[PDB]
Amino acid sequence: SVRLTWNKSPKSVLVIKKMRDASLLQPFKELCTHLMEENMIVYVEKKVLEDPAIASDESFGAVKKKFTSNQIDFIICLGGDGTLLYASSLFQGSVPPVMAFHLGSLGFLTPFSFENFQSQVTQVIEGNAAVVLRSRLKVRVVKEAMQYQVLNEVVIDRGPSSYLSNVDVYLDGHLITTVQGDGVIVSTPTGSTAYAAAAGASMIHPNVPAIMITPICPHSLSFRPIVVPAGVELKIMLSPEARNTAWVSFDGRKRQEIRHGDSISITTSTYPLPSICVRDPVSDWFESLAQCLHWNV
Amino acid sequence: SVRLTWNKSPKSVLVIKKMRDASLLQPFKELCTHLMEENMIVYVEKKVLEDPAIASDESFGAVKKKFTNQIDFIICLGGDGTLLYASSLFQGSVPPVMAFHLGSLGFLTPFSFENFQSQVTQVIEGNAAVVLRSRLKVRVVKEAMQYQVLNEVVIDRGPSSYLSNVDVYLDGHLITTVQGDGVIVSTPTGSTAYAAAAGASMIHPNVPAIMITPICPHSLSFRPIVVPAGVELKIMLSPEARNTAWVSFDGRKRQEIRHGDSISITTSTYPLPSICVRDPVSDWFESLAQCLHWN
Amino acid sequence: VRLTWNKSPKSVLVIKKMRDASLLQPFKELCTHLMEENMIVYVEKKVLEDPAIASDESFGAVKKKFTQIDFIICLGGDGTLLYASSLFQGSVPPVMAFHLGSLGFLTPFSFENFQSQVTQVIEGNAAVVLRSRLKVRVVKEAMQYQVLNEVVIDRGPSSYLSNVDVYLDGHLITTVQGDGVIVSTPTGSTAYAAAAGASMIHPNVPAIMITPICPHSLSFRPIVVPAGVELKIMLSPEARNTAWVSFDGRKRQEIRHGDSISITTSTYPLPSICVRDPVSDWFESLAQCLHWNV
Amino acid sequence: SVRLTWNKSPKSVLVIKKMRDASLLQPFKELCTHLMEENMIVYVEKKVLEDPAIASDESFGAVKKKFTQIDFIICLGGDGTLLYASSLFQGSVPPVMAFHLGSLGFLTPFSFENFQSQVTQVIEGNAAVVLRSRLKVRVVKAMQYQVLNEVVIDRGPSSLSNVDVYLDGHLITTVQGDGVIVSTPTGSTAYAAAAGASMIHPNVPAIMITPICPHSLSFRPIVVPAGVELKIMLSPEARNTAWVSFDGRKRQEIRHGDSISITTSTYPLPSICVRDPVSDWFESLAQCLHWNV
């Protein structure tokens, strides 16, 4: 039940929109006006302020000139479960608190509703609103060097190919299983409702410190989606007696092939992602399950 | 349980080897010598009799010369892939197929290689039980190309990313729109194939039905369904989708399907008969036990 | 599918779900219309004795005209058609099931404009689904049953694992260990069998399902076998305690070491009339009731 | 990485046997003689030393008199003995070492071969342990229970079940079906696994909620933070009694006014690992339930 900690009053706001959506153009204008109305410096993505849709409207040009890594104090995200992934990408270090709004479809990371947004934003800036310290994974891909921070899942699966994958999974140098099938969806508790859920994984509340291992259509019918303690060091590498190679993805981002020499190491990060909740960590998660994924209906 | 009907005594044998396996050389040589001992014409794949392993061994050159709608009986070597190749090579009325498992045992390879001469003589002379395995007549129409599929036809997100939105029409009615990795519409014989890894139930090959199984569906309440055999399926991309989908036929040629393309699936009239070592039922459960660890 | 009455229908057997006030008034409207035509109406003798139906003197006018079955009309959801099969161990006549409120897998017909729908079934030809049933025979150290949805062998007033052997043509296939088994017809694939992880089978597939209840082994999945097979389930000799058998949520009887149960597809199917077609009715039922898509 | 802290050298040992097995009769004699050989008091259940098998054998009568606050627990049997060990210790339970004579379970890491050398290491040296979580359960009609594997609320001698589940005062779900199998991470490999639950390592501090054959096709097992307050009670509608079981112990009947509350206990069960907590758990998966062939 961590409430909040500002230390110094907020002054920098990084507003990130899902883009490529006309429906989000108009609500973006209203929020920026109110945020700019208060004595708060507003950061917006560099590419966002130069789209033809935002450039054509000369009415909004009044505040466009007042826009502007390590000085962001608070993040506002527009969009459902596709924007918070991008927010974590720009912050490999300590990411500030993130408040996500759902305009239409409601996701697992977007509790706040857009109606009466002025009152909700003022409460976060002035008052205290409860947060969930969501866990993240740091993955290192060693080539025979390149870290990543992953919020939902890292997937090691067969890319363009036909043969079943044969990749070995190590847990603290104590090789546990060799998964044969499409792949594995090693994931955080936040990703338990993500693509990992489609593979038969159980749904973990984001306050449970753990790392999940879930196959994608395993060949063995007794292979279950285990979950391991948070502080363990994983290591996934191709088995030496295995034809064809495998591809790795990071929250639906850059895909790079791993061969008989490359190894990926997974460990829980020390820089969590705080997401603000509208009511409380427990009720919002269960409300999200029913409204989005139909947990009980 | 239909046994056998030769009409005329067998004279042509088509032997397919799994290939790319040195362990299959000597048993193949022994079987070919035994078959050539009898007055039976032996057909072997043309590109099989040109490998460096089969060319270097000059001892086998004594019988190498005697090789060669004209096949009466099929002998298969390999596990669960050789019968796929045989079905691919025979788009019409495929003759009876007998499969031998040399090491690993599959769902389509009941016969053991020990005392192979006696088993082959019994199959040729006597009557042995068969399973008339069903196949699918998939037709892909472009904005023209039929295939016969024994295990499964898969429509999934191929060399690309992002979710999939493809519509499934059954007898002209949109039954469902599957979102996820894809769908594994398959025969009962494929119920133990990759369709099984996606959560499908295990259907005995004497059940006349067609299965529909998703690959990691987005909705938690979307269970595999099985539909009557004599149904006409039709899978095509949803109009409100951007990324195209890729279709595979038993792990064979993959072709991307765009908005204007549709695939139609219907039970074939040319089944694949596979001879059983003991009976059509017990062999399936034995294969489930050892091959797949059913319990 | 090409329904022929041979002789025009004259006997109608109406079964109500009972213990439901909401079904009292709709029952009155249908019986008046059915009695309006020159058609003998059969109703269960215990139906016309409830205080609710006796108190209303207005309906007493046609109560006397109630009373070899040619056609069956059912009211209720997924619980009435099971009772309809119970009274007919032989050739059950076609059954038309109405849903008032909740919609089930056995009840396609909507109660609105029931007069037009009933007249079409009586006069015109409608489409039917020949639902498969199981001839279950229990032999002690003989009681024969007909089961439409499922026969379940599981622990009852006790709490321990189960070790029961499943024989298939004398070639015992597995010893299921866990809660039990839900051997069932395709019509029961949208029932308690489905709650155990069974795939949903269209009722035109002629096969028999075997679905465990919480099996102890992780790699043990529901199987479906050809319809014409003879199943035989009996307790394993090296197993303590006993198991209990249920027939569509009906009488339970304990089976001990010497008792065996034999299951075989019946030769007397249950014809259920569909509103549009055998296929699209089933898929609509999946979405509206079991949420197969959402 | 805490391993063990005896503080005071062990002097009291409670040896509990799975019983009802002739194969376990002989190994029981060997261990008790060796444990009594060292200057260490041995406790045995009072009903154990009265069976015809133990009374008839006059050879073992030499030390039968010397049997008699427990400092260390030795268990014989597979996955059925530590449940009995938890029952006798509702407070702080001492370290528990379990031997698998034949069948290999999840709470029984130690093998009986070269037992004497293994016993000396535990008494003298330090061995790694798993602080397994337990659930304190209150049934209010205030009879508490401590549960190691699972508490099950399911239909019993009857024929669906409509029972409500509350989490910190909020109705999270209403489960319809056979019932709910709320369990600890140690119970994830127990009958909770047969219900479709994922397999949780016993070092993950969480509480699992899993249905038993739920009516809805989409009702996935959920796992919640350890320090949360569960409260399960019958729905006001669908008046039919449900039954509650605690690791297969006394099955009670819950009516409309009965409530069951589940929270993580503050008295864990320390089970001694054989080589290390991580590798031992994966070894048990391969042999017991054949996880990935």
UniProtKB/Swiss-Prot annotation, chain A:
Tissue expression from the record: Widely expressed but not detected in skeletal muscle.
GO biological process: ATP metabolic process; NAD metabolic process; NADP biosynthetic process; phosphorylation; positive regulation of insulin secretion involved in cellular response to glucose stimulus
Gene Ontology cellular component terms for the protein in this record: cytosol
Part of the whole protein covered: 95 to 429 of 446
A GO term, aspect molecular function: ATP binding
pH-related activity note: Optimum pH is 7.5.
Key words of the record: ATP-binding, Kinase, Metal-binding, NAD, NADP, Nucleotide-binding, Phosphoprotein, Transferase
Family per similarity comment: Belongs to the NAD kinase family.
Record-given protein name: NAD kinase
Temperature dependence: Optimum temperature is 55 degrees Celsius.
EC supergroup of this enzyme: transferase
Recorded catalytic activity of this chain's protein: NAD(+) + ATP = ADP + NADP(+) + H(+)
Lineage, opening ranks: Eukaryota, Metazoa, Chordata, Craniata, Vertebrata
Swiss-Prot record, chain C:
Cofactor(s) the protein requires to work: a divalent metal cation
Record-level Gene Ontology MF annotations: ATP binding; metal ion binding; NAD+ kinase activity
Keywords associated with the record: ATP-binding, Kinase, Metal-binding, NAD, NADP, Nucleotide-binding, Phosphoprotein, Transferase
Keyword Lipoprotein tagged: no
Entry note: thermal dependence: Optimum temperature is 55 degrees Celsius.
Catalytic activity annotation: NAD(+) + ATP = ADP + NADP(+) + H(+)
Tissues/organs with expression: Widely expressed but not detected in skeletal muscle.
Activity's dependence on pH: Optimum pH is 7.5.
Its EC number(s): 2.7.1.23
A GO CC term assigned to this protein in UniProt: cytosol
Enzyme class: transferase
Gene Ontology annotations of biological process type: ATP metabolic process; NAD metabolic process; NADP biosynthetic process; phosphorylation; positive regulation of insulin secretion involved in cellular response to glucose stimulus
Family: Belongs to the NAD kinase family.
Protein's name according to its UniProt entry: NAD kinase
